[PDB]
Design a protein around this ligand. Sequence first.
Ligand code: SF4
Ligand code: SF4
Ligand code: SF4
Lengths: 176, 145, 155, 54, 45, 115, 209, 53, 317
Amino acid sequence: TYKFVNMREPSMDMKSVTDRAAQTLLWTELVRGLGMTLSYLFREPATINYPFEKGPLSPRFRGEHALRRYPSGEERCIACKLCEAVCPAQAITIEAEPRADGSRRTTRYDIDMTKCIYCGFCQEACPVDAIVEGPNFEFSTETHEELLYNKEKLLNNGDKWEAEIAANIQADYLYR
Amino acid sequence: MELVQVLRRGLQQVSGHGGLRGYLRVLFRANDVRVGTLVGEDKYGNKYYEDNKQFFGRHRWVIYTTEMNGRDTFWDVDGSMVPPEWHRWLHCMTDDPPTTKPPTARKYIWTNHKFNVSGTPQQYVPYSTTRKKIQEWVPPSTPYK
Amino acid sequence: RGEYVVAKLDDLVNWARRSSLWPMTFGLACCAVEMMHMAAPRYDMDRFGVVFRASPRQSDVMIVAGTLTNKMAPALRKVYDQMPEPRYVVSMGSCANGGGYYHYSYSVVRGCDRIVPVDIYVPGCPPTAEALLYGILQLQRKIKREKRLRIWYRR
Amino acid sequence: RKTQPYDVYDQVEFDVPIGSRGDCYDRYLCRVEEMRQSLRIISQCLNKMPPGEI
Amino acid sequence: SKVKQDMPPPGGYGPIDYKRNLPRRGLSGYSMFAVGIGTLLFGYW
Amino acid sequence: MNIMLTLLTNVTLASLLVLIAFWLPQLNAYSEKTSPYECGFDPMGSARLPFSMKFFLVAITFLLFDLEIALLLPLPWASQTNNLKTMLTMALFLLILLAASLAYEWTQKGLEWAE
Amino acid sequence: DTRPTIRPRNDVVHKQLSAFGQYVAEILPKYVQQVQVSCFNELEIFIHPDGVIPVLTFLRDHTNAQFKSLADLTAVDVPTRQNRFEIVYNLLSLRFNSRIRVKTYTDELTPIESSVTVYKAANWYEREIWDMFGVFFANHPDLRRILTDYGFEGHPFRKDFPLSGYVELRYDDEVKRVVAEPVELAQEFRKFDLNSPWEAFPAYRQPPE
Amino acid sequence: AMTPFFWMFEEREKMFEFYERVSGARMHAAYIRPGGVHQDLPLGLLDDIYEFS
Amino acid sequence: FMINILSLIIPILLAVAFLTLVERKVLGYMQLRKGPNVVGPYGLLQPIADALKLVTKEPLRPGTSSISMFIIAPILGLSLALTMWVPLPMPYPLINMNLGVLFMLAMSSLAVYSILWSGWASNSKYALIGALRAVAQTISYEVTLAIILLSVLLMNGSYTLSTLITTQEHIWMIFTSWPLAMMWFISTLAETNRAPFDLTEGESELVSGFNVEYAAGPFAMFFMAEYANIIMMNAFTAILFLGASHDPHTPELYTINFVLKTLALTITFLWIRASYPRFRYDQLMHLLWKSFLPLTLALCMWHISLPIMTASIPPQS
Ligand code: SF4
Ligand code: SF4
Ligand code: SF4
């Protein structure tokens, strides 16, 4: 089923024709847009006060990567390399080494944001929820070398950003 | 009657914002004169407000502190002084302040939340996190045999 | 004191510079449409004191938003060089920051910095309208932190 | 959507605006009407969400 | 516990309007014109 | 000479604005900045080739009409004469003559863009 | 299907398309080689290269086919064949709401008569294909690069063409305009030979050889 | 005229708001995948859809 | 005497500067935005911020440009707009002028010449085309503007701007020539190069029209010139139709009334800027020569015989 959109032949009645003539001579439909625009002017603007005020978000938001750690303190990553194998832009580079004890995690864990896509695929690919997409959209910088993190800062990012994601995965662990 | 009602709302606005000095402070720095309930106050001096009566996205807002880690910010500000516990509340990822239920405190979390250190000497630098892979054969210390 | 006077004129110059800088109406890919997302009344580009002008002889800060390609490269450098000084460049998104999702592509230059100097690298793919609106703020702070006529006085 | 339905689009009911001149005014008018017909699809989709997995 | 997801209300959501609701405002063309000369003729007097 | 004084002041005040906007705000030109603008690319090379009008017909009629209005500018003083009878006919006659010329051009195409 | 996992079938359509598959075969026995309808109701006509313009004309013209819409132009490249590039058309019949696929084969050197006359939509699809794959077609109006960089040598979509390309460019201040150089990646494409060493589908397995 | 652009980009942003609510990001969801959507909608999302529609 | 000149010139520049703020702010409020409010209280410091930054921006001199031609036009544009503010009948005009409107009309035509010359002086397509669209724009409005101007003041008595206050007196002039004010208002819209008739600028169509090679200070004089032009000609339409009462003992009573009349009318100029799409300069000369010209003759014939109709010939003095 379809609905015809544009054909309505105007009536040639004296009342109807003087309507179009009045509309033409006296700008009436033209002032209709002018007039409503006045009504919309008096509406209070829907502008937030950045950075004093920030827009709504959701627990399942993708931001900067942050390598988390267990409540004891041991970092969750166990070098399964699934995040590297899934990363659609190969932003992850992984090297591993059994060091001394129950802490062989990474020789190298470099996430390349200017290469990364922020798809979040690494987050649900991780079997231990080690690498996560943090809730911080605010990690801009001035140098290109800044926009890549080493393994250490991922740990520092997970250390610095810890309360937010711990509660975020707390609320979202059943959805995914 | 409603006209003078909004006039006294402005008269309430100047009075409630710490008199004239506070109102001129927020007008020239906070860029807004709205008054909200004191929802919380973190350890960094950042003053937070909540006004559920306002339309969505303008219910919860933040007045930033004048000092953070020796980075005087009375005039200039940015969206990164917010500590991790409150950063989810500001972005309304949740309808609970950290004061009502604090996050699970553990040993390794930072005690002083930091901001973008870009430009400052505290900025990050990329570096190799791996050891040397091909170490060279050290020349013998002894002279000609 | 001469340094006091130069500092006062310095404060006058950057305040006008960071308050009245004019981003270029330049857009390439996914980042461009989110760039105009924040220009929408939700985030209000203009309330921070900036307005969109088109030609290079018109604007202050180049806002590179989208994938940079080999064919796009000659015009971008031409249009950037065509902007009178002072001029700044911010790099929207992972793609323009460097390489991006198509870093390994044959028809993508790995980095807008490989072609034009860059002040700030705003990340995200696409960067949320909040994140880059801070990127403008960081440039306002960066414009604040200069000593152009001050370094000249001690030069 | 109507000639070769896909997914669950067969059960939904809506109209497709059809122009009469093939000019810019018709296309803009069909685009506007498609938005209204899109809203009707949202109403049917909202009230017909079935239980089960994802 | 029973399965719970995001579901429509038991009665269902309200009726979603989609048609045009353009107002019919203004006055008749004769009245608009007759006003035009009416104030106009006042002018020359 | 009062009009001269404000005219001299006006063109003077304009000249200071261009004067300190050309020397004070730095100077750095390196050719491609100095080059013409072609929406990012290099022009075909011209800006001097004949940019032929497509409305040349109406341009000359403007000269005839802008000329003839100068014939009816004296109207406010022409009303206050002892002979408004022939004044009414002659002044009317001009307006019909412009009306006829506009009507003549209108009917024989004219105003519509020549293609 | 009582089982809700697998996709259902439309056997009525599958046979119906197969009936039309043999329909075209008798109509043009010179040009078609074999006509196959896949399991998921997609009936493809396989025609000879030199007869490209007539079969497309027949489907656009014939009442029983009436396929007048050039959906897409693709020339999927398979290096193992003598004439690698197999040019695949894509047509939609509005009156019979069905899709047809006609395809040929053509090496790097053999030219094809351009189908712009039979399908004006082929025009820009033609400018793209010669760009990406490098198969020249004959008597095209303005066959010329419309995808790749101005003067970019080599057809990038070819199998022998590396994904990273051969050249990269960078602005140089000593000449004050951008300039190209051989490609030298900061990070190479780490190839991921993830193909499973175990057979995945007994049905599609080739006969022993 | 530029005002229609700013009329509905507000409402366009709301559709971005549910976009980010049910998916990982605002624009590029990577949501619709072969075999079905990535994950279930958050509770209360449909009610917001009802109000916006 | 010169103290009167500076008090006539200097306030206009600040008024022009604060026009940029309201241009960017009432539009935003008329557009669900909040407008510039980050620079000082409510943005009132933004017009200052624009001024210095534009002045301290690098001036640009394109290689293919004619240097003398590139500089004379911006001077002409700003100077005429500023000198356009001397002859208005604002309670005590700076210069009484027998041919008040002719002085108004003559240099208004010379104002477009600065608009005209800058296009080719910049030596490119995007300015040559914008310059030639200025030709067609002033092809249209000029052929008729004198007709409206003659018609409205034919009941005034003479061309002196001062006599407008006496002529209006009891009632608004628009009450007597409302279809003329319909003609006059939007034709001024067509000369100020505002949104519905800004083809000379042409934001979307040709980047910036007659501004593409202009930068820094030359624009600052150009931006002020056209902002001064709209306010002045709006003040012209304020006295032409909405002239208020003037008490000789209290001249300030006229200023407060006149200022709002040209201010609320100005808000309209910002009002149309938001709500209406762009005329194509094809229909611009088409419309003003198809319906506008034949109509404006009819009321011109109406407005000449009608003083003779009712023995209401106005005195020249
Ligand atoms: S979102 Fe995660 S998996 Fe995807 S590219 Fe970025 S880091 Fe890699
Ligand atoms: S972050 Fe997770 S997926 Fe990646 S290597 Fe570590 S444990 Fe494996
Ligand atoms: S960074 Fe992401 S959003 Fe931006 S242009 Fe590249 S792919 Fe599009």
